[PDB]
């Protein structure tokens with residue numbers, strides 16, 4: 215298009231709290247930690 | 260009138276019972292997790308990370 | 310047809326014979342897991358009695374069914390957020406690979 | 409939020425509420441263009457009864 | 458047909474012989490005005506997609522309002538701010554209006 219909250223019969227889809235960019239950042243952090251430190255990054259520093 | 264009341268109250272009871280069943284399934288999962296945690300965490304030493 | 314369970318394979322068992330690998334492979338497999346649903350929310354008053362005062366007044370007789378349905382859906386959505394949080398947000402910091 | 413939760417006190421958080429705020433509503437009636445008129449003209453104003 | 462809602466200029470192309478629009482739930486969505494050959498979308502006049510962010514009333518009574526999936530220019534028309542209490546018109550325009 216460019217109000218969908220009342221167009222349908224009261225049904226809406228709330229957005230997730232963590233955007234796909236945030237999930238990608240989390241997976242990136244996990245992957246970099248695993249690659250550069252192994253399992254140590256999970257136990258502590 | 261009593262049939263209307265009975266239907267409504269029976270629906271309320273059924274809803275409550277179904278909610279209780281679902282919450283009890285949740286609590287059963289949590290209790291299984293706690294039992295496994297006591298087995299592998301207190302009665303031993305787990306190498307499972309985190 | 311009558312489905313086949315798998316390929317028949319007898320093991321050459323013997324009380325003094327062992328089988329030791331001489332080479333290996335590094336296999337990468339894929340495992341897919343669902344983590345969350347779509348955070349659906351329903352406007353119960355508008356769904357049952359869309360823009361109708363008389364219907365809304367009648368629906369108000371049925372007590373708090375509508376409220377508890379909304380509460381259940383809100384719990385579902387919060388639970389989905391928590392699921393995503395627990396699956397992914399398990400690292401305290403944000404590491405980045407060196408150049 | 410207070411009435412939709414049936415309480416006078418509200419805890420921290422984002423609640424989803426109802427819609428109590430009413431608005432006055434006017435009425436409209438729409439029908440097609442008036443056509444297809446009977447022969448009443450030649451029935452009332454007829455030459456001879 | 459009879460109903461309640463807001464009539465808005467539409468974007469659809471009704472066929473020459475079709476009169477009333479319809480959604481998937483057998484609910485009127487758009488209509489053809491009987492006199493003027495113009496198509497009007499019928500958007501129900503009710504907003505239940507309103508969330509109220511609040512710190513605990515113990516701490517303060519200041520709140521924020523989130524309207525679901527709307528632009529910040531469509532807010533005083535989505536909730537009909539002109540027919541609301543003046544204290545609700547605080548939460549329809551202003552300077553603290555994020556998107």
Ligand SMILES: *[C@@H]1O[C@H](CO)[C@@H](O[C@@H]2O[C@H](CO)[C@@H](O)[C@H](O)[C@H]2NC(C)=O)[C@H](O)[C@H]1NC(C)=O
Pocket residue numbers: 331332333334
């Ligand atoms: C172990 O297996 C690997 C492959 O799984 C062998 O590597 C192959 O070696 C031959 C010749 O030596 C090459 O032509 C192939 O291209 C190689 N394959 C790969 C995937 O690199 C390796 O030689 C085997 N080692 C032993 C001792 O059997």
Ligand SMILES: *[C@@H]1O[C@H](CO)[C@@H](O)[C@H](O)[C@H]1NC(C)=O
Pocket residue numbers: 215216528
């Ligand atoms: C909201 O406004 C922005 C202006 O930057 C526009 O790009 C967007 O299409 C608008 N949203 C809708 C639903 O029209």
Ligand SMILES: *[C@@H]1O[C@H](CO)[C@@H](O)[C@H](O)[C@H]1NC(C)=O
Pocket residue numbers: 441492493
């Ligand atoms: C209906 O009448 C109006 C004027 O009374 C005219 O402008 C319009 O074109 C007419 N529509 C049809 C479909 O005859």
Ligand SMILES: *[C@@H]1O[C@H](CO)[C@@H](O)[C@H](O)[C@H]1NC(C)=O
Pocket residue numbers: 448449450452453
């Ligand atoms: C009959 O003629 C008169 C004028 O003399 C007119 O006013 C009236 O409307 C006519 N009747 C009908 C049914 O049109």
